[PDB]
Amino acid sequence: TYTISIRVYQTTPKGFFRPVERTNWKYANGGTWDEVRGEYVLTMGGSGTSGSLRFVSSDTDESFVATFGVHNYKRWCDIVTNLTNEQTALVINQEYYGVPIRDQARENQLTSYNVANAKGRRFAIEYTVTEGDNLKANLIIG
Amino acid sequence: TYTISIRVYQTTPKGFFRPVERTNWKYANGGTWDEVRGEYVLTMGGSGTSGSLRFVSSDTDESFVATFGVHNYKRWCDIVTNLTNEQTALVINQEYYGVPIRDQARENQLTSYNVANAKGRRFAIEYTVTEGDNLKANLIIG
Amino acid sequence: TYTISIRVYQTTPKGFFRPVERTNWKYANGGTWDEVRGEYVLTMGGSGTSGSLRFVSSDTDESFVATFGVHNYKRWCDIVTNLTNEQTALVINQEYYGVPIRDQARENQLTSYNVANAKGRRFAIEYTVTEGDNLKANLIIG
Amino acid sequence: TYTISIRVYQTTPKGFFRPVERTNWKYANGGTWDEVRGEYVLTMGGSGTSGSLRFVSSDTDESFVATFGVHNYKRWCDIVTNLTNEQTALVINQEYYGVPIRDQARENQLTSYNVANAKGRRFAIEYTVTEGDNLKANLIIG
Ligand SMILES: [C]C(=O)[N][C]1[C](O[C]2O[C]([C][O])[C]([O])[C]([O])[C]2[O])[C]([O])[C]([C][O])O2[C]1O2[C][C]([N])C([O])=O
Ligand SMILES: [C]C(=O)[N][C]1[C](O[C]2O[C]([C][O])[C]([O])[C]([O])[C]2[O])[C]([O])[C]([C][O])O2[C]1O2[C][C]([N])C([O])=O
Ligand SMILES: [C]C(=O)[N][C]1[C](O[C]2O[C]([C][O])[C]([O])[C]([O])[C]2[O])[C]([O])[C]([C][O])O2[C]1O2[C][C]([N])C([O])=O
Ligand SMILES: [C]C(=O)[N][C]1[C](O[C]2O[C]([C][O])[C]([O])[C]([O])[C]2[O])[C]([O])[C]([C][O])O2[C]1O2[C][C]([N])C([O])=O
Ligand SMILES: CC(=O)N[C@@H]1[C@@H](O)[C@H](O)[C@@H](CO)O[C@@H]1O
Ligand SMILES: CC(=O)N[C@@H]1[C@@H](O)[C@H](O)[C@@H](CO)O[C@@H]1O
Numbered sequence: 396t397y398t399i400s401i402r403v404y405q406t407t408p409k410g411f412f413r414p415v416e417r418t419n420w421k422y423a424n425g426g427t428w429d430e431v432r433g434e435y436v437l438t439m440g441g442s443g444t445s446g447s448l449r450f451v452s453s454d455t456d457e458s459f460v461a462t463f464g465v466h467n468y469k470r471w472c473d474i475v476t477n478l479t480n481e482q483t484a485l486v487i488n489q490e491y492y493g494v495p496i497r498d499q500a501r502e503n504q505l506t507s508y509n510v511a512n513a514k515g516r517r518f519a520i521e522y523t524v525t526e527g528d529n530l531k532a533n534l535i536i537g
Numbered sequence: 538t539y540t541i542s543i544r545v546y547q548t549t550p551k552g553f554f555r556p557v558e559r560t561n562w563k564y565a566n567g568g569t570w571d572e573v574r575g576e577y578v579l580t581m582g583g584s585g586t587s588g589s590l591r592f593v594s595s596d597t598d599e600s601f602v603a604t605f606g607v608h609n610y611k612r613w614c615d616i617v618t619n620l621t622n623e624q625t626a627l628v629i630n631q632e633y634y635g636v637p638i639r640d641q642a643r644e645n646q647l648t649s650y651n652v653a654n655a656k657g658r659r660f661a662i663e664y665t666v667t668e669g670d671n672l673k674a675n676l677i678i679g
Numbered sequence: 680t681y682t683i684s685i686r687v688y689q690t691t692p693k694g695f696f697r698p699v700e701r702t703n704w705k706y707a708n709g710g711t712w713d714e715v716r717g718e719y720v721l722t723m724g725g726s727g728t729s730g731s732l733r734f735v736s737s738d739t740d741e742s743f744v745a746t747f748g749v750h751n752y753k754r755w756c757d758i759v760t761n762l763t764n765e766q767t768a769l770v771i772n773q774e775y776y777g778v779p780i781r782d783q784a785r786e787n788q789l790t791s792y793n794v795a796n797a798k799g800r801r802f803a804i805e806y807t808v809t810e811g812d813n814l815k816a817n818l819i820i821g
Numbered sequence: 822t823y824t825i826s827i828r829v830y831q832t833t834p835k836g837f838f839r840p841v842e843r844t845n846w847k848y849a850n851g852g853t854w855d856e857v858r859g860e861y862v863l864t865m866g867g868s869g870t871s872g873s874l875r876f877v878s879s880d881t882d883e884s885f886v887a888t889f890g891v892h893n894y895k896r897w898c899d900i901v902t903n904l905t906n907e908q909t910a911l912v913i914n915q916e917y918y919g920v921p922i923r924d925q926a927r928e929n930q931l932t933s934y935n936v937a938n939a940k941g942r943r944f945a946i947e948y949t950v951t952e953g954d955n956l957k958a959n960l961i962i963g
Contacts, residue, residue, distance in 0.1 A: 406832045408947075408959045413859030415569035416561050419591075424622040427557035427593060429716045433839030440622060449561075451569060480566035480582065485627050521834070533834045548690045550805070550817045555717030574855045575697030663692075675692045699853035700845050703875075708906040711841035711877060724906060733845075735853060764850035764866065769911050 397442070399463045399470070399530045401435040410457060410516075412536055416449035416484040420464070420492065442468045445501070447488040450536070459518050460487040461534055469504040470530050472520040473497070476512040511537075539584070541605045541612070541672045543577040549658075552597035554678050558626040560589045562606070562634065584610045587643070589630035592678070601652075601660050602629040603676055611646040612672050614662040615639070618654040653679075681726070683747045683754070683814045685719040694741060694800075696820055700733035700768040704748070704776065726752045729785070731772040734820070743802050744771040745818055753788040754814050756804040757781070760796040795821075823868070825889045825896070825956045827861040833942075836881035838962050842910040844873045846890070846918065868894045871927070873914035876962070885936075885944050886913040887960055895930040896956050898946040899923070902938040937963075 405412060417428040417435070424440025428448075437446040445464025452458065459476040460483075475487050490497040500508075509519040517537035524531035547554055559570040559577070566582030570590075579588040587606025594600065601618040602625075617629050632639040642650075651661040659679035666673035689696060701712040701719070708724025712732075721730040729748025736742065743760040744767075759771050774781040784792075793803040801821035808815035831838055843854040843861070850866030854874075863872040871890025878884065885902040886909075901913050916923040926934075935945040943963035950957035 402834070402837045404832065404834050405830045408828075408830050408961060411828050411859070413571070415571065416559060418560050418627040419558050419625040421623040421625050421628050425625050429555070429557065431715050432713045433837070481563040483561040483563050483567045485560045485630060486563050488627060489631075535834060544692075544695050546689045546692050548688065550686070550688050550819060553686045553717070571858045573857050575695070677692060697855070699855065700843060702844050702911040703842050703909040705907040705909050705912050709909050713839070713841065765847040767845040767847050767851045769844045769914060770847050772911060773915075 397439045397465050397528050397530065399437045399532060400431065401437070401448070401463065401532050401534050402433075403435070403534045403536070405536045407537065410452040410455040412450040412452045412457070414448065415451045416447070418447045418484045418488045420444045420446065420488050422492070437463055439465065442466070445471075445488065445491060447484040448534075449484040455514070457512060457514060457516060459512070460484050461518070461520060462488060462491060463520070463532065464491070464501065466501050466504055470506065470522055470525060471501050471504045472508050472522070472532065473500040474508060474510045474518050474520060476510060476518060539581045539607050539670055539672065541579045541674060542573070543579070543590070543605065543674050543676050545577065545676045545678070547678045549679060552594040552599060554592040554594045554599070556590065557593045558589070558591035560626045560630040562586045562588065562630050564634070579605055581607060584608070587613070587630065587633060589626040590676070591626040597656070599654060599656065599658060601654070602626050603660070603662060604630060604633060605662070605674065606643065608643050608646055612648065612664055612667060613643050613646045614650050614664070614674065615642040615647070616650055616652045616660050616662060618652055618660060681723045681749050681812050681814065683721045683816060684715065685721070685732070685747065685816050685818050686717075687719070687818045687820070689820045691821065694736040694739040696734040696736045696741070698732065699735045700731070702731045702768045702772045704728045704730065704772050706776070721747055723749065726750070729755075729772065729775060731768040732818075733768040739798070741796060741798060741800060743796070744768050745802070745804060746772060746775060747804070747816065748775070748785065750785050750788055754790065754806055754809060755785050755788045756792050756806070756816065757784040758792060758794045758802050758804060760794060760802060823865045823891050823954055823956065825863045825958060826857070827863070827874070827889065827958050827960050829861065829960045829962070831962045833963060836878040836883060838876040838878045838883070840874065841877045842873070842875035844910045844914040846870045846872065846914050848918070863889055865891060868892070871897070871914065871917060873910040874960070875910040881940070883938060883940065883942060885938070886910050887944070887946060888914060888917060889946070889958065890927065892927050892930055896932065896948055896951060897927050897930045898934050898948070898958065899926040899931070900934055900936045900944050900946060902936055902944060
């Protein structure tokens with residue numbers, strides 16, 4: 396059993412991102428999302444699956460999907476932004492298991508990743524605990 | 538714009554169901570899940586999409602996925618229980634748009650539905666507001 | 680360090696109680712309230728303090744304050760209902776340290792307590808784990 | 822009826838502040854705290870009362886209480902930090918109605934306030950809507 400506990404940091408008062416969706420991929424006996432002591436906790440039944448969080452800022456027409464998982468016993472993460480209205484977390488989460496560019500992101504097994512949207516705002520995931528079964532990460536909104 | 542506001546009633550202190558997943562289907566410009574005054578609010582861009590909530594009782598090995606949406610301008614609902622580990626809300630939500638046994642449930646446009654798991658526990662959805670833009674439902678865990 | 684983890688059960692779809700307030704008394708190095716896996720967790724720095732939760736049903740003009748603590752190394756609980764508009768949880772929590780009838784409730788060190796409001800609805804606290812530093816309780820709304 | 826809707830911005834991934842307490846003062850027929858679309862909403866019956874939020878960073882031994890309300894039909898705010906274990910939100914909220922050093926802060930009817938703790942971390946409240954029934958504020962953690 397793995398857990399990934401996520402702390403969300405919203406660094407600028409320009410815009411307001413709110414949680415809108417949390418999904419679990421079906422591999423490795425699935426997983427769950429819990430809220431624990433102000434953090435988002437993804438629990439997974441083994442190595443080889445993942446979960447996604449979507450955040451939306453309706454003030455500024457911005458959004459992103461942040462995905463966290465374990466691939467071949469190493470943690471991974473990705474962020475997708477510039478989302479179409481069809482790109483919910485349900486959609487994005489699944490694409491990491493068949494879409495070459497998404498597959499690659501997962502295979503990279505990154506301890507940190509950042510990307511910016513077309514509006515110039517950057518988002519980042521930073522794993523603070525990178526080993527073991529109780530992983531920890533910061534999700535930083537620029 | 539449609540909203541479905543859901544009040545959850547957990548009625549029996551045997552086991553404990555906790556929220557573990559909330560998904561949005563990609564049709565009709567997608568949608569969002571918000572927590573509002575103790576209720577779950579599914580917001581959708583138009584008719585033809587849906588969202589799912591999964592609840593799990595770890596203590597009793599029980600779970601279900603409750604799905605809510607609008608089909609041909611009428612509200613619908615369904616509950617799936619006796620879940621395998623592979624049947625996350627991400628999986629179940631998607632099945633309502635291609636899997637015949639799920640398609641037909643959506644097409645039924647039900648104002649109420651109830652089902653039992655293998656242990657005999659009943660789960661119910663009852664829409665209290667069945668018309669207009671802002672729909673309301675009770676999710677009752679037996 | 681003590682924890683009291685509380686599972687809330689709302690047993691009837693008549694009315695809807697929502698959380699509106701959570702307070703910590705100042706004795707025994709204070710305490711905190713956390714949301715953990717769908718439960719309300721009161722953490723306290725020792726024996727001799729408590730915390731309160733207030734729930735309101737605006738549909739039916741009903742409310743109550745449920746208080747949980749440890750007195751002389753034994754758990755206690757109480758419920759106050761038929762609240763005046765001045766009886767917030769901030770007020771009620773404090774009254775267990777100076778008001779004779781409230782003092783008595785605390786001194787009783789009950790593993791279970793129930794009371795009904797003037798409208799005929801009963802509320803109950805039931806400790807499922809009654810010993811140790813990780814106590815557990817059901818808050819049952821009739 | 823007044824509302825104050827609060828957006829929380831945690832801006833620095835050093836330490837992690839989590840919500841631990843939310844209180845309502847008893848004047849003006851009291852009030853409630855609700856979570857609405859990722860925001861904290863304080864609702865009050867009329868002018869002359871307030872509510873407090875406490876946040877704690879366990880990893881860095883930091884904490885603060887942020888208080889919001891309406892005094893003589895104008896919004897007010899304050900932040901207290903460098904807290905002892907005995908300074909819960911229940912304690913601090915009440916002090917604004919009898920303790921001169923707190924009374925004067927309420928009477929100031931501030932649209933913005935900022936303060937630093939002993940470690941040099943700044944905390945700020947800025948009202949973005951300063952007039953009418955439905956007030957809005959940012960709570961910024963430095
Ligand atoms: C161990 C790991 O991680 N692996 C992985 C996987 O996961 C898996 O899946 C399966 C089905 O297919 C099941 O579910 C199990 O349980 C799990 O574990 C997958 O995910 C993949 C993607 O697709 O990836 C990974 O792997 C790689 C390869 N295939 C090998 O094996 O090596
Ligand atoms: C109107 C309605 O409701 N319709 C429906 C639909 O939805 C849709 O989808 C599309 C794609 O395909 C888009 O997204 C839009 O936007 C929407 O609206 C669908 O969902 C279906 C299922 O699949 O169902 C319904 O319909 C009926 C028929 N099929 C038609 O199409 O018309
Ligand atoms: C141990 C116990 O529990 N005790 C108690 C108390 O608590 C206390 O308090 C103090 C001040 O006063 C401090 O804070 C400390 O820390 C604590 O611990 C109190 O609370 C009381 C009520 O008032 O009760 C109890 O006790 C009894 C008597 N006093 C004896 O001691 O025994
Ligand atoms: C109008 C206003 O805001 N006022 C105020 C007050 O509030 C009040 O309170 C009372 C008792 O005392 C009752 O609760 C009512 O309802 C209300 O409204 C108070 O709070 C104060 C503080 O303590 O402050 C304000 O005011 C001024 C003067 N002091 C008078 O009284 O007028
Ligand atoms: C702007 C944007 O969202 N780019 C994403 C990138 O972050 C992600 O790593 C990749 C694979 O999923 O898909 C897109 O290229
Ligand atoms: C109807 C009602 O709320 N009664 C309460 C009772 O439950 C509580 O035990 C006592 C001491 O706090 O105060 C009141 O009598």
